[PDB]
Design a protein around this ligand. Structure first.
Ligand SMILES: [Zn+2]
Ligand SMILES: [Zn+2]
Ligand SMILES: [Zn+2]
Ligand SMILES: [Zn+2]
Ligand SMILES: [Zn+2]
Ligand SMILES: [Zn+2]
Ligand SMILES: [Zn+2]
Lengths: 107, 141
């Protein structure tokens, strides 16, 4: 399935941008009314499998109540990451990572 | 709980990161709301924007704020109220309190002036020493 970003951020990713489900940087982040961020894919799967609750505080939560968190989504994509390829030392902003990998030397 | 009075100018332990400042009033976010453009505003600053130009446009993107996509940033609200600020008793008190319980600290802080438990006593007293004015130093025993 689709969980999060697996890329090794240039400085460590801060806790506030880590998905409590998949333990990775939020992918198309969404926020709950109780104030917790998840990936869009991770949280709706839990809604479907675990029920209508926020897994961090068991507060009531329905799929429509989720709003996209485009402030974190911007900051996360602005975070700098390393290209995981063997021998490549290229650090770029996360939004440019697939731009670099498309013509990365070591692949 | 965990609320604060936005009128006060607080002195933050670490310098206030701009991500916690409102995109319109530039102060620290009070009851932050995020918009569909990905920008945060105080609650009274979103309505203030709503009263003007009909379409409240975002001060940064100039993107039109579609009220269906505005939501309370309760997570950002918590990160803000957990920011540490120095106490109002500036040099005396060494306490680094969180902003959400700033007003609760002054209610117990030793060095905030407690005017005296007396008839009159226009004496200036600290909380630490008012039991020490009932002691011998105030004019009643
Ligand atoms: Zn996730
Ligand atoms: Zn929650
Ligand atoms: Zn590379
Ligand atoms: Zn504001
Ligand atoms: Zn905006
Ligand atoms: Zn104090
Ligand atoms: Zn007295």
């Amino acid at each position: 399935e689709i969980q999060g970003y697996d890329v090794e951020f240039d400085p460590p990713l801060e806790s506030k941008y880590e998905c409590p489900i998949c333990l990775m940087a939020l992918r198309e982040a969404v926020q709950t009314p109780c104030g917790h961020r998840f990936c869009k894919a991770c949280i709706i799967k839990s809604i479907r499998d675990a029920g209508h609750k926020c897994p961090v505080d068991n507060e009531i939560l329905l799929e429509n109540q989720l709003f996209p968190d485009n402030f974190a989504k911007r900051e996360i994509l602005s975070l700098m990451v390393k290209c995981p390829n063997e021998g490549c030392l290229h650090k770029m902003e996360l939004r440019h990572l697939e731009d670099h990998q498309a013509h990365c030397e070591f692949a | 709980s965990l609320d604060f009075e936005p009128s006060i100018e607080y002195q933050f332990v670490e310098r206030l990161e701009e991500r916690y400042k409102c995109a319109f009033c530039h102060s620290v976010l009070h009851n932050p709301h995020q918009t569909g453009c990905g920008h945060r505003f105080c609650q009274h600053c979103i309505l203030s924007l709503r009263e003007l130009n009909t379409v409240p446009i975002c001060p940064v993107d100039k993107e039109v704020i579609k009220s269906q996509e505005v939501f309370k940033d309760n997570c950002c609200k918590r990160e803000v109220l957990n920011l540490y600020v120095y106490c109002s008793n500036a040099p005396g008190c060494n306490a680094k309190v969180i902003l959400g319980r700033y007003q609760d600290h002054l209610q117990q802080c030793l060095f905030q002036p407690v005017q005296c438990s007396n008839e009159k006593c226009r004496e200036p007293v600290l909380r630490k020493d008012l039991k020490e004015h009932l002691s011998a130093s105030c004019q009643f025993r």
